[PDB]
């Protein structure tokens, strides 16, 4: 719970350099296993734009459109392709609660006041509270953007889930 | 109290170093029977020792 | 006094040092300072302050909350440690009082 | 009792009398254009989004008619 | 009273909980919507024309399809070199063989296994997993240094008599094991391999040193890839066909977007020294009291 407020205020204070918008999430047994959620090191997100590459590169053109050409020496470009690939990810905050709970009764056990339209009392065995950012380039925002959720365990392996921006804001953007 | 009065013969990796430092003469290949009267001035592998 | 006494221990350390600790809880409107007498097996000051910070972080968040909710009023401190001496683990007596007490009137050492 | 051959770098397995090589080439060129196993995922997500938006049209035609 | 944003954040509460899926409909994660976020007070506009969704689905199609078009390139290279040599393949892997044996049926089983492996390709396979060390950080200088150390001249007696002492006869190979007695395909397989010094062929063992014993089984077929992207496809009897995997018909940033190997940063319980034996994981667990 406690990470959502902090990330809200952080994206508020960092809004003029990048116009990211907060995206407070919860993950549960439908996503990753409890053995995976007990050793989950950190998360990773990336605001890939609507039509093209990503946010962490030049808008028009780069030196990564070229073929790899199957060489041994600079197999994929060299180190600069590694730097471009490392720069485009941003680290979101992270908080995992590895005990079974109910979300609404948890938030009422904290100070918040959930007023849901009908009792969708969701139950889960472990709740990891994550909070991504999604970009608006101008103050408007296209629905054709997508996200890339990257979950990292300390062995080096990862998993990737992707979803668009349209389904995220299908009703809540239409509620404002 | 100048820096060096023979800057072809003093820097580590110059000519008269690599011609007369005995480690460099081992890495060049030389007859050890021939005595060189400059060996006593450029053996800073052992002069430092 | 049974009310002011507390510890975070099984009190099975041999040399039980004592420590006066007060805090400043700003959840009340003015202040609700919880005065406390604290024994401990631990003797060094700084690591004891770190354990107390681990135990009293609610008063620290209350302290920062007082700082944001009232800028003109200066927050004074958060708490002050002062050791008094040391005893033995059998010298306690359940009002809990001590039969022997070596004294050491230490200094008011603040902490946040 | 058993008889065999020790392996080498100069022993060669020949083509199978070109009666099976031709069906190998048939299987090569009958699958140059077909299921690429790439747009099958696009097919699944397009079918699922199409079902979703068609059911949304059902909710819209059921409520906006009132 | 300059009342804090935290208290109005909590007492403002959360509007509604909305779940959402991913694009492949695999995971389903839930999203909260707090009212006291600054999301409301920026007055954002929002619109989605359909051509942008079409281009987004095409770009996501490319991002999913890069692996399978690499596998299709592998299959095309196999068939290309199999037409190119004329059907005559050598034995590159050590296995004792018999002369009186039916071999056309092994060709039939090889075609069958090839079609089966093309049916069951996946992103967790040989060429992708062997490609992940190639995309790494220090791969460029490592391959350059290995190339220079390979392409060094014959040493004179000077560096042998006074210079420093000179100096990987085994390799870390990756394998896809397919098998048609049960139609069971095995994807992520690691094989230790080196040369047999009595001959010129390869010996394939486990990391334990099992001397991997599927090559005698007449029904399996294996694909081998090496870290220098040398290619091998071995039917039973030790005969195999070799090539190079060609990725030059593919973009670069797609390959780094898809499965570029990860680099980690420092968290708690990690050595600020580089490369020592770390202690255990942080391991925030629910079996203990969380302390």
TrEMBL record, chain B:
Taxonomically, the superkingdom here is Viruses
**Which protein is depicted?**
Major capsid protein
Q: Which organism is it from?
A: Human cytomegalovirus
Automatic annotation (TrEMBL), chain C:
Q: What is this protein called?
A: Capsid triplex subunit 1
Please tell me whether the keyword Oxidoreductase is annotated for this protein.
no
Q: Give the GO cellular component terms, alphabetically.
A: viral capsid
Q: Does the keyword Transcription apply?
A: no
Q: Name one GO molecular function term.
A: DNA binding
Source domain of life: Viruses
Please, one GO biological process term?
A: viral capsid assembly
The organism encoding this protein is: Human cytomegalovirus
Keywords for this entry?
Capsid protein, Host nucleus, Virion
Automatic annotation (TrEMBL), chain D:
Q: What is this protein called?
A: UL77 protein
Source organism of the structure:
Human cytomegalovirus (HHV-5)
Query: Which portion of the complete protein is shown here?
Result: 12 to 77 of 642
Give the superkingdom in one word: Viruses
User: What lineage is this protein's organism placed in?
Assistant: Viruses, Duplodnaviria, Heunggongvirae, Peploviricota, Herviviricetes
């Amino acid at each position: 719970m406690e990470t959502h407020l902090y990330s809200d205020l952080a994206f508020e204070a960092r809004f003029a350099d990048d116009e990211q918008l907060p995206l407070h999430l919860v993950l549960d047994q439908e996503v990753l296993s409890n053995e995976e959620a007990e050793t989950l090191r950190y998360v990773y997100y990336r605001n890939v734009d609507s039509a093209g590459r990503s946010t962490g590169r030049a808008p028009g053109g780069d030196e990564d459109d070229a073929p790899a050409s199957d060489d041994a020496e600079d197999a994929v470009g060299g180190d600069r392709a590694f730097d471009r690939e490392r720069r485009t990810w941003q680290r979101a905050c992270f908080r995992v609660l590895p005990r079974p709970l109910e979300l609404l009764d948890y938030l009422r056990q904290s100070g918040l006041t959930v007023t849901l339209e009908k009792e969708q009392r969701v139950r889960m065995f472990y709740a990891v509270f994550t909070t991504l950012g999604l970009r608006c380039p101008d103050n408007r925002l296209s629905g054709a953007q997508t996200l890339h959720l990257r979950l990292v365990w300390p062995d080096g392996s990862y998993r990737d889930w992707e979803f668009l921006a349209r389904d995220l804001l299908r009703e809540e953007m239409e509620a404002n | 109290f100048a820096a060096t009065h023979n800057p072809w013969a003093s820097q580590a990796g110059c000519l008269s170093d690599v011609l007369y430092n005995t480690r460099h003469r081992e890495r060049l290949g030389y007859n050890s029977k021939f005595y060189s009267p400059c060996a006593q001035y450029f053996n800073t592998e052992e002069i430092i020792a | 006094p049974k009310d002011m006494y507390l510890t975070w221990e099984e009190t099975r350390g041999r040399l039980q040092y004592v420590y006066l600790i007060i805090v400043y809880d700003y959840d009340g409107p003015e202040t609700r300072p919880g005065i406390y007498v604290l024994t401990s097996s631990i003797a060094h000051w700084q690591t004891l302050v770190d354990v107390a910070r681990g135990k009293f972080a609610r008063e620290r968040c209350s302290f920062v909350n007082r700082r944001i909710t009232r800028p003109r009023q200066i927050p004074l401190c958060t708490g002050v440690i002062q050791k008094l001496g040391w005893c033995l683990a059998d010298d306690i007596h359940t009002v809990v009082r001590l039969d022997n007490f070596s004294v050491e009137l230490g200094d008011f050492r603040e902490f946040v | 009792v058993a008889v065999f051959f020790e392996p080498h770098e100069e022993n060669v397995l020949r083509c199978p009398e070109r009666v099976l090589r031709r069906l190998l080439e048939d299987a090569a060129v009958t699958m140059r254009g077909g299921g690429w196993r790439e747009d099958v995922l696009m097919d699944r997500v397009r079918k699922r989004y199409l079902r979703q938006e068609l059911r949304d049209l059902g909710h819209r035609v059921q409520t906006y008619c009132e | 009273d300059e009342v804090a944003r935290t208290d109005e954040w909590k007492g403002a509460g959360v509007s509604r909980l909305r779940e959402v899926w991913d694009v492949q409909h695999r995971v389903r994660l839930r999203v909260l919507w707090y009212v006291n976020s600054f999301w409301r007070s920026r007055e954002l506009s929002y619109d989605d024309h359909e051509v942008e969704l079409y281009r987004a689905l095409d770009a996501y199609r490319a991002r999913i399809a890069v692996e399978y078009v690499l596998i299709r390139a592998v299959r095309d290279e196999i068939y290309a070199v199999l037409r190119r040599d004329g059907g005559a393949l050598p034995q590159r892997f050590a296995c004792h063989v018999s002369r009186n044996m039916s071999w056309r049926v092994v060709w039939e089983l090889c075609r069958h296994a090839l079609a089966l492996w093309m049916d069951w390709a996946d992103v967790r396979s040989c060429i992708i997993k062997a490609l992940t060390p190639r995309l790494s950080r220090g791969a460029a200088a490592a391959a350059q240094r290995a190339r220079r150390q390979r392409e060094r001249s014959a040493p004179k007696p000077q560096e042998l008599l006074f210079g420093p002492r000179n100096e990987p006869a085994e390799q870390t190979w990756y394998a896809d094991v397919v098998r048609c007695v049960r139609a069971q395909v095995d994807l992520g397989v690691e094989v230790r391999a080196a040369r047999c010094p009595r001959t010129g062929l390869w010996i394939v063992r486990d990391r334990r040193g099992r001397l991997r014993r599927w090559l005698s089984q007449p029904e399996v077929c294996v694909l081998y890839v090496t870290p220098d992207l040398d290619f091998y496809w071995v039917l039973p009897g030790g005969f195999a066909v070799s090539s190079r995997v060609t990725l030059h018909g593919l973009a670069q940033r797609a390959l780094r977007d898809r499965f570029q190997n990860f680099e980690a940063v420092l968290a708690r319980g990690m050595h600020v020294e580089a490369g020592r034996q770390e202690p255990e994981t942080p391991r925030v667990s629910g079996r203990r009291l969380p302390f």
